[PDB]
Amino acid sequence: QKQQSERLGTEAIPKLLRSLSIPAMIGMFVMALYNVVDTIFISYAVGIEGVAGVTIAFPIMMIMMSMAGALGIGGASVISRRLGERRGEEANQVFGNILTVILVLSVIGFISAFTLLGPALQLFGATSVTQGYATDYLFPILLGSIFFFFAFAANNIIRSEGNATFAMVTMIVPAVLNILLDVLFIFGLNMGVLGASIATVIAQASVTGLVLRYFLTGKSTLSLHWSDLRMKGSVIKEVCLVGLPAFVQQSSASLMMIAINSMLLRFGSDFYVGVFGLVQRIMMFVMMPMMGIMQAMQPIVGYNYGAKQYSRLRETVMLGFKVATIFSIGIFALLMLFPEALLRVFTADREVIQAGVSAMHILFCVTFLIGAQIVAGGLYQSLGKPKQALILSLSRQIIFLIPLVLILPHIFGLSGVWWAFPIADVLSFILTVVLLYRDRNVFFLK
């Protein structure tokens, strides 16, 4: 029991989504800019040798943020399941008792900087150039670590409460900084990668500075305490309980995309890694749309399960599906008519716009099914029962995907690239259909 500060808690619900989504949408977008407008730099004061540095580096960046993401999400879906179900101070408790595990790790990485950095970095496709570059990238970022985690903690708790707005600002603002701050070093000076990393730390510094305000200074939205508040919860088990699938879901891809990257270092030393690199930020970018609609119900479907207005969550959960679906067909469409024009950033051969878009064609007559197949994922996760999402993730990500790339590539072709995806997802979907008539309880409405 606390003071439910302004935000909402008001059940104004399908503008609770309206208003909630767009914030994510926005900075989610913005910061995706930073990529672009930053890497396009790293593709200058350095060439492509380091554009690859970055990209090898990457999944090690993700190896951390996943753990903290868990710990983040956990927080959210705890702190939502405990603000309708109004344990208003269990909240206060959690928050800090996460900051623990964080500042625990914040150091595991400060350690691992001065440790497992190189060991693992060289441990696949180490190109002497790129080696040094990705080292030069990863070192600072870990120094380093703290600002980083706390700030994904922050941005996830504060959604988990309600500030999608102050969110924006946790994004918008590295972003703006992390351009001008790059230009500062990267081109402006000449500290390239070596210096883009120490930019993107001074980024994540000058936010944390600020989230401290939206947690201490006129502590905003909700329960937030700071001298002894946290020690080491018995809740730790409650958060890892949650995040359990949450961090699976990254270490699912992340850990498998070390592979596809390091195996695409054995053929294409760099030329091809900078096009892994690229072909991502169009998936994720044109994922956002969905991603962001997701993070709206992160916590909406949060204070209403709780002990609150069950009648008004199906309203979300239905709506939530509903929207996603129109942006399912959405992305899908424009994914399949403009697959030229986006293969005009890829302008090379007339066989590059051939099997280079033979893939980008009926690879994605799945997309339109993905809407729910990923909405599903939030509403086993906002409702801290991440045991069926767990079951659900390792379906989508591994147990059906590799077994089917494997069952195709044990000779079947660069079709074992095709069928291995469009068909994988569908079972994830059909399964995710079942996962819901499994509970005529999320949607006990239609």
Header resolution in angstroms: 3.2
Q: Six-digit token pair at 56?
A: 């090898």
3-state secondary structure of 239: helix
Query: What was the structure determination method?
Result: X-ray
Q: What is the C-alpha separation between 100 and 106, in angstroms, rounded?
A: 10
Question: Rounded to 5 degrees, what are φ and ψ at 68?
Answer: -65, -30
Dihedral Cα 233, 237, 242, 246, nearest 10 deg: 100
Structurally, how many domains does the chain consist of?
1
Given a contact cutoff of 8 angstroms between Cβ atoms, the answer to whether 378 and 301 are in contact is yes
- SS3 for 234-262 is CCHHHHHHHHHHHHHHHHHHHHHHHHHHH
DSSP state of 348: -
DSSP state of 446: -
Given a contact cutoff of 8 angstroms between Cβ atoms, the answer to whether 196 and 177 are in contact is no
String of DSSP letters for 168-201? HHHHHHHHHHHHHHHHIIIIISS--HHHHHTHHH
Residues spanned by the domain of 240: 1-446
218: phi > 0 → left, psi -120 to 50 → alpha, else beta; which? Answer: left
**118, burial (CB in 10 Å: exposed 0-12, middle 13-18, buried 19+):** middle
Which amino acid is located at 179 in the chain? Answer: I
Given a contact cutoff of 8 angstroms between Cβ atoms, the answer to whether 375 and 291 are in contact is no
Q: What is the C-alpha separation between 243 and 240, in angstroms, rounded?
A: 5
